[PDB]
């Protein structure tokens, strides 16, 4: 009913399929956030740092980054603008070896460990 006001009802005719996206459930975000670390590996594939994130790390992210109303953009911001900050800092001086199986975890301490294992 809005596409016949704004979009001049022939557009309702001409378009084959009007897909309508749901807001993101939290069951998807265990995968959608997990996809971004694989795309984060593609930006560190020169550096050969393989960042592996488990669901014990994902749950801390969703609880403190996700509202449904914005559709999980700031969760994305929360990865890049917060936890990715001193992945960059620890690489500057000699603290990030270019071959470490980097892992993220929470001991339910409200505190993060990034685990470096060769």
């Amino acid at each position: 009913k809005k596409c016949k006001k704004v979009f001049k009802p022939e557009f309702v005719n001409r378009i084959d399929k009007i897909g309508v996206f749901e807001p993101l459930n939290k069951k998807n975000l265990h995968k959608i956030v997990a996809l971004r670390f694989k795309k984060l590996e593609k930006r560190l594939e020169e550096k050969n740092i393989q960042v592996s994130v488990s669901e014990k790390a994902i749950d801390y992210i969703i609880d403190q980054s996700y509202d449904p109303e914005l559709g999980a953009r700031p969760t994305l911001i929360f990865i890049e603008s917060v936890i990715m900050t001193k992945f960059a800092i620890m690489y500057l001086k000699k603290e990030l070896v270019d071959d470490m199986d980097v892992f993220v975890d929470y001991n339910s301490k409200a505190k993060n460990l990034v685990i470096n294992l060769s």
Binding site: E95, L113, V114, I115, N116
Partner: peptide, 5 residues
């Protein structure tokens, strides 16, 4: 925290 070997 960082955990390095």
């Amino acid at each position: 925290d960082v955990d390095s070997s």
